[PDB]
Design an enzyme around this catalytic site. Structure first.
Site, PDB file in Angstrom:
ATOM      1  N   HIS A  45      64.643  -9.809 -46.913  1.00 48.74           N
ATOM      2  CA  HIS A  45      64.100  -8.894 -46.160  1.00 48.74           C
ATOM      3  C   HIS A  45      64.345  -8.637 -44.766  1.00 48.74           C
ATOM      4  CE1 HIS A  45      61.394 -10.456 -49.503  1.00 48.74           C
ATOM      5  NE2 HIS A  45      61.585  -9.032 -50.180  1.00 48.74           N
ATOM      6  N   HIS A  47      62.072  -8.237 -41.750  1.00 46.32           N
ATOM      7  CA  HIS A  47      60.732  -8.231 -41.179  1.00 46.32           C
ATOM      8  C   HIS A  47      60.826  -7.453 -40.034  1.00 46.32           C
ATOM      9  CE1 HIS A  47      59.088 -11.634 -44.010  1.00 46.32           C
ATOM     10  NE2 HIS A  47      60.168 -11.198 -44.252  1.00 46.32           N
ATOM     11  N   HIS A  62      57.434  -7.162 -43.743  1.00 51.74           N
ATOM     12  CA  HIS A  62      58.566  -6.664 -43.951  1.00 51.74           C
ATOM     13  C   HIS A  62      58.557  -5.229 -42.996  1.00 51.74           C
ATOM     14  CE1 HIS A  62      58.785  -8.218 -48.523  1.00 51.74           C
ATOM     15  NE2 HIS A  62      58.523  -9.245 -47.181  1.00 51.74           N
ATOM     16  N   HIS A  70      55.218  -2.214 -51.174  1.00 48.70           N
ATOM     17  CA  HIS A  70      56.495  -3.060 -51.319  1.00 48.70           C
ATOM     18  C   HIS A  70      57.243  -2.583 -52.776  1.00 48.70           C
ATOM     19  CE1 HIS A  70      59.211  -6.509 -51.290  1.00 48.70           C
ATOM     20  NE2 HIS A  70      58.914  -6.904 -52.705  1.00 48.70           N
ATOM     21  N   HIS A  79      59.451  -1.026 -49.004  1.00 50.10           N
ATOM     22  CA  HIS A  79      59.706  -1.006 -47.430  1.00 50.10           C
ATOM     23  C   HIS A  79      61.012  -0.816 -47.157  1.00 50.10           C
ATOM     24  CE1 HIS A  79      56.370  -4.078 -48.169  1.00 50.10           C
ATOM     25  NE2 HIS A  79      55.574  -2.969 -47.980  1.00 50.10           N
ATOM     26  N   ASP A  82      63.023  -3.887 -47.413  1.00 50.75           N
ATOM     27  CA  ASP A  82      63.397  -4.557 -48.741  1.00 50.75           C
ATOM     28  C   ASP A  82      64.591  -4.487 -49.439  1.00 50.75           C
ATOM     29  OD1 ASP A  82      60.106  -3.336 -50.015  1.00 50.75           O
ATOM     30  OD2 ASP A  82      60.506  -5.088 -48.907  1.00 50.75           O
ATOM     31  N   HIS A 119      63.514 -16.022 -48.624  1.00 50.63           N
ATOM     32  CA  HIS A 119      62.462 -16.485 -48.979  1.00 50.63           C
ATOM     33  C   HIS A 119      62.612 -17.728 -49.955  1.00 50.63           C
ATOM     34  CE1 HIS A 119      59.318 -14.186 -47.129  1.00 50.63           C
ATOM     35  NE2 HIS A 119      60.426 -13.239 -46.938  1.00 50.63           N
ATOM     36  N   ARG A 142      59.135 -18.522 -45.952  1.00 49.94           N
ATOM     37  CA  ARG A 142      60.014 -18.268 -45.392  1.00 49.94           C
ATOM     38  C   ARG A 142      61.056 -19.143 -44.888  1.00 49.94           C
ATOM     39  NH1 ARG A 142      56.790 -14.026 -41.230  1.00 49.94           N
ATOM     40  NH2 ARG A 142      55.686 -12.939 -42.751  1.00 49.94           N
TER      41      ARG A 142
HETATM   42 ZN   LIG Z   1      58.418  -5.255 -48.899  1.00 47.52          ZN
END
Ligand SMILES: [Zn+2]
Ligand SMILES: [Zn+2]
Lengths: 152, 152
Positions: A45, A47, A62, A70, A79, A82, A119, A142
């Site tokens: 992602h 962020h 995100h 999401h 997002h 994403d 992640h 993370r």
């Molecule tokens: Zn997301």
């Protein structure tokens, strides 16, 4: 032709670099090349922030300019940040190419200055049973991140 | 939006940060990320005081304005601080979110300036049958803590 680059920092195994590329307002191409990851699928992602004062923790959630739920990069529900899952191979290595149309390198929705985060676990894509599914795809910790620096 | 953040200290190699969040007077959401812990279940509570002159020990019992005995977060019979267990994975990290109604960030019962404590062992939830089940959940052992400060 705008260009960015995120050099990944990690406290666990994780190394690597992720290049971004945008010609005009065509899509952005993210090519990634990473190591030190558990084989399998890992959330990926953009962020919202590139505040690194508390490592990856401080990079916010995100990137969501559109205020949506999401989803996967393939959903309209989604997002901007994403980018879905990246597939880690047996040797702990991933080497991918993603083309996306919500992570521009220029303008008011720019991801320049923001972080990419890998992640610990698979991104749900909004579809797992879980309480966090529709906000984070329940991808766990993370494990690596770097700020998307302007490249020359 | 009220915000809080606790930075963990420990003399035992535990590290982590815990975020709190509360819209108006909805529930508080707590999102934590912690490392250096034995895998499995660890009890996780908001404690009464934020007094760290004697380490985690000076932080008092579980936060308890109602004068109840110890429970699970889902019970009526429950301290306000009864936040249950967190699950520590095989790498000794825990990444978790808990939504709770009894830990406000504003008002008389506000947890800001109190401490959050991670315990050595699993919380009983009041059901273990131990002499301390109805007080500490037999989780016993303060292994890290942090004072909940006001966040930006
Ligand atoms: Zn997301
Ligand atoms: Zn309790």
């Amino acid at each position: 032709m705008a260009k960015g680059v995120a050099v990944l920092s990690s406290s666990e195994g994780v190394a690597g670099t992720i290049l971004f590329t945008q010609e005009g307002d065509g899509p952005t191409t993210v090519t990634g090349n990473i190591s030190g990851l558990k084989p399998g699928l890992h959330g990926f992602h953009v962020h919202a922030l590139g505040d690194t004062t508390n490592g990856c923790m401080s990079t916010g959630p995100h990137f969501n300019p559109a205020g949506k739920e999401h989803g996967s990069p393939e959903d309209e529900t989604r997002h901007a940040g994403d980018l879905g899952n990246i597939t880690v191979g047996d040797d702990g290595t991933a080497c991918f190419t993603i083309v996306d149309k919500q992570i521009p390198l220029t303008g008011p929705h720019s991801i320049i200055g923001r972080a990419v985060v890998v992640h610990a676990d698979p991104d749900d894509l909004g579809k797992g049973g879980h309480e966090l599914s529709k906000s984070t795809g329940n991808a766990g910790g993370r494990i690596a991140c770097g700020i998307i620096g302007l490249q020359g």
